[PDB]
Amino acid sequence: GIVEQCCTSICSLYQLENYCN
Amino acid sequence: FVNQHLCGSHLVEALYLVCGERGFFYTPKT
């Protein structure tokens, strides 16, 4: 989930937008 | 501000700024 993609590894805009409604 | 390690409040602030009026969901435990 978001922690693994953006906190433990380097985040990206692509990944962040996966969590927008 | 996106292309780094973002944790905790820093991650939810990035979501807030990126997602804007769409809003977002923050689910740290999956």
DSSP labels, B1-30? --SS---THHHHHHHHHHHGGG-B------
A1 touching B (Cβ < 8 Å): yes
A17 in contact with chain B, both atoms CB, cutoff 8 A: yes
Q: What is the largest CA-CA distance in chain A?
A: 23
| Residue B8 buriedness (CB in 10 A; 0-12 / 13-18 / 19+) | exposed
Q: Tell if the CB–CB gap between B24 and A19 is shorter than 8 Å.
A: yes
A18, B10 contact by CB (below 8 A):
no
| Residue B9 forms contact with A (CB below 8 Å) | no
Residue of chain A whose alpha carbon sits nearest to that of B7 = A7
